[PDB]
Design an enzyme around this catalytic site. Structure first.
Site, PDB file in Angstrom:
ATOM      1  N   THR A 115      40.888  23.857  98.328  1.00  0.00           N
ATOM      2  CA  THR A 115      41.242  23.103  99.518  1.00  0.00           C
ATOM      3  C   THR A 115      41.801  21.725  99.185  1.00  0.00           C
ATOM      4  OG1 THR A 115      38.910  22.495  99.635  1.00  0.00           O
ATOM      5  CG2 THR A 115      39.646  24.317 101.002  1.00  0.00           C
TER       6      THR A 115
ATOM      7  N   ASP B 166      63.761  41.015  88.420  1.00  0.00           N
ATOM      8  CA  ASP B 166      64.149  39.805  87.713  1.00  0.00           C
ATOM      9  C   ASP B 166      64.939  40.130  86.450  1.00  0.00           C
ATOM     10  OD1 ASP B 166      62.166  36.815  87.729  1.00  0.00           O
ATOM     11  OD2 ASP B 166      64.193  37.076  86.918  1.00  0.00           O
TER      12      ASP B 166
ATOM     13  N   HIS C  32      62.738  34.336  82.208  1.00  0.00           N
ATOM     14  CA  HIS C  32      62.407  34.045  83.600  1.00  0.00           C
ATOM     15  C   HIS C  32      61.551  35.153  84.205  1.00  0.00           C
ATOM     16  CE1 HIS C  32      63.765  32.622  87.804  1.00  0.00           C
ATOM     17  NE2 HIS C  32      62.969  33.661  87.984  1.00  0.00           N
TER      18      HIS C  32
ATOM     19  N   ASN D  94      66.378  26.857  95.127  1.00  0.00           N
ATOM     20  CA  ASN D  94      66.203  25.545  94.509  1.00  0.00           C
ATOM     21  C   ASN D  94      67.373  24.609  94.814  1.00  0.00           C
ATOM     22  OD1 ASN D  94      63.919  26.842  93.291  1.00  0.00           O
ATOM     23  ND2 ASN D  94      65.282  27.597  91.663  1.00  0.00           N
TER      24      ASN D  94
ATOM     25  N   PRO E 114      64.256  37.280 107.680  1.00  0.00           N
ATOM     26  CA  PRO E 114      62.998  36.844 108.315  1.00  0.00           C
ATOM     27  C   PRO E 114      61.808  37.764 108.059  1.00  0.00           C
ATOM     28  CG  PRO E 114      64.502  37.696 109.957  1.00  0.00           C
ATOM     29  CD  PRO E 114      65.290  37.594 108.681  1.00  0.00           C
TER      30      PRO E 114
ATOM     31  N   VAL F   7      60.787  39.343 105.399  1.00  0.00           N
ATOM     32  CA  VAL F   7      60.104  39.215 104.113  1.00  0.00           C
ATOM     33  C   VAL F   7      59.414  37.857 104.078  1.00  0.00           C
ATOM     34  CG1 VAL F   7      61.857  40.700 103.084  1.00  0.00           C
ATOM     35  CG2 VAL F   7      62.007  38.195 102.814  1.00  0.00           C
TER      36      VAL F   7
ATOM     37  N   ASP G 135      58.085  30.779 105.048  1.00  0.00           N
ATOM     38  CA  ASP G 135      56.790  31.202 105.558  1.00  0.00           C
ATOM     39  C   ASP G 135      55.622  30.441 104.960  1.00  0.00           C
ATOM     40  OD1 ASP G 135      58.142  34.379 105.901  1.00  0.00           O
ATOM     41  OD2 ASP G 135      56.995  33.434 107.517  1.00  0.00           O
TER      42      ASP G 135
ATOM     43  N   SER H 251      61.436  29.980  92.314  1.00  0.00           N
ATOM     44  CA  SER H 251      61.195  31.175  91.520  1.00  0.00           C
ATOM     45  C   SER H 251      59.823  31.165  90.851  1.00  0.00           C
ATOM     46  CB  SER H 251      62.284  31.346  90.458  1.00  0.00           C
ATOM     47  OG  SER H 251      63.493  31.844  91.017  1.00  0.00           O
TER      48      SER H 251
ATOM     49  N   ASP I  32      48.806  19.873 104.390  1.00  0.00           N
ATOM     50  CA  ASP I  32      48.402  19.176 103.177  1.00  0.00           C
ATOM     51  C   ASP I  32      49.571  18.740 102.307  1.00  0.00           C
ATOM     52  OD1 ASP I  32      45.691  19.490 103.837  1.00  0.00           O
ATOM     53  OD2 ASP I  32      45.566  21.416 102.798  1.00  0.00           O
TER      54      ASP I  32
END
Length: 279
Positions: free
Chosen positions: A16, A39, A69, A161, A175, A177, A200, A224, A260
């Site tokens: 938290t 990937d 990656h 990015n 939307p 996913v 999301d 990523s 947060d």
């Protein structure tokens, strides 16, 4: 279970508060779930994967990760030290060449591949796909991610990015996913992270220490790198019976650490992926 001196991103998803250094997770650890890492491939021989990763598909001359990656992403999903879901099965789909580039059509075919391949795998707890890739907007790349989602696979994709709205990027803008942004260890929106109403959730994205090819490790940054935090979290949650593939993204958003993060643009969710584990 408790992993001391864990990577900050792992300690964050189970906290938290920022600034702690211990993973806490249910020891099921994603037993019996599956995460496709779509990937550059996975160095399955890395000792950090313990034989739980394997290449199931490539579109290039080799299925080895000559980039790192994909190995890095797979390590965040389910490696032993570096991974959210330390007992998940990892399947590598090499849609990106070893420079990290792939044509949209190969990427699309890789998404359709997983939506069928999952019927050749044993994933009684559910299937996740981690898409740590993206480019400009494409309705066909978006529709392929929607099909993969619709097929019963959680799809977690990177927001991108670009430090822009993810509405202009695919599959980030699809939307249905789970479009993942990136945050850093001080609970700031990762500098580079895309944003917008399509995002999301946020995962740890800045200086994420994961597996690297050649049996090594390194720290790198990117949405990523946040995506496999959410992909692994989902596999972890599905194994626990707390959510399904169709509702994982949402459940993760319902149970997230709320309000947060800092430098979250107006209109973007202030949700940080949180496993809600009580030790």
């Amino acid at each position: 279970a408790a992993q001391t001196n864990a990577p900050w991103g792992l300690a964050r998803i189970s906290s938290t508060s920022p600034g702690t250094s211990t993973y806490y997770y249910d020891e099921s650890a994603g037993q019996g779930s599956c995460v496709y890492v779509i990937d550059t491939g996975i160095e399955a021989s890395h000792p950090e994967f313990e034989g739980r990763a394997q290449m199931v598909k490539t579109y290039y001359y080799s299925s080895r990760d000559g980039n790192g990656h994909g190995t890095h992403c797979a390590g965040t999903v389910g490696s032993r030290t570096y991974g959210v879901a330390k007992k998940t099965q990892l399947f590598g789909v090499k849609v990106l060449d070893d420079n990290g580039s792939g044509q949209y059509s190969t990427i699309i075919a890789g998404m359709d591949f997983v939506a069928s391949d999952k019927n050749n795998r044993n994933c009684p707890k559910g299937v996740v796909a981690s898409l740590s890739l993206g480019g400009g907007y494409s309705s066909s790349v978006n529709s392929a991610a929607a099909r993969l989602q619709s097929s019963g696979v959680m799809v977690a994709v990177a927001a991108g990015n670009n430090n822009a709205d993810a509405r202009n990027y695919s599959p980030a803008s699809e939307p249905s996913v789970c479009t993942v942004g990136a945050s850093d260890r001080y609970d700031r929106r990762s500098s580079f992270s895309n944003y917008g109403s399509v995002l999301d959730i946020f995962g740890p994205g800045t200086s994420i220490l994961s597996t690297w090819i050649g049996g090594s490790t390194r720290s790198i940054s990117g949405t990523s790198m946040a995506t496999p935090h959410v992909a692994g979290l989902a596999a972890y949650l599905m194994t626990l019976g707390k959510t399904t593939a169709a509702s994982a993204c949402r459940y993760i958003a319902d149970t997230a650490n709320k309000g947060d993060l800092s430098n979250i643009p107006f209109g973007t969710v202030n949700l940080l992926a949180y496993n809600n584990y009580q030790a």
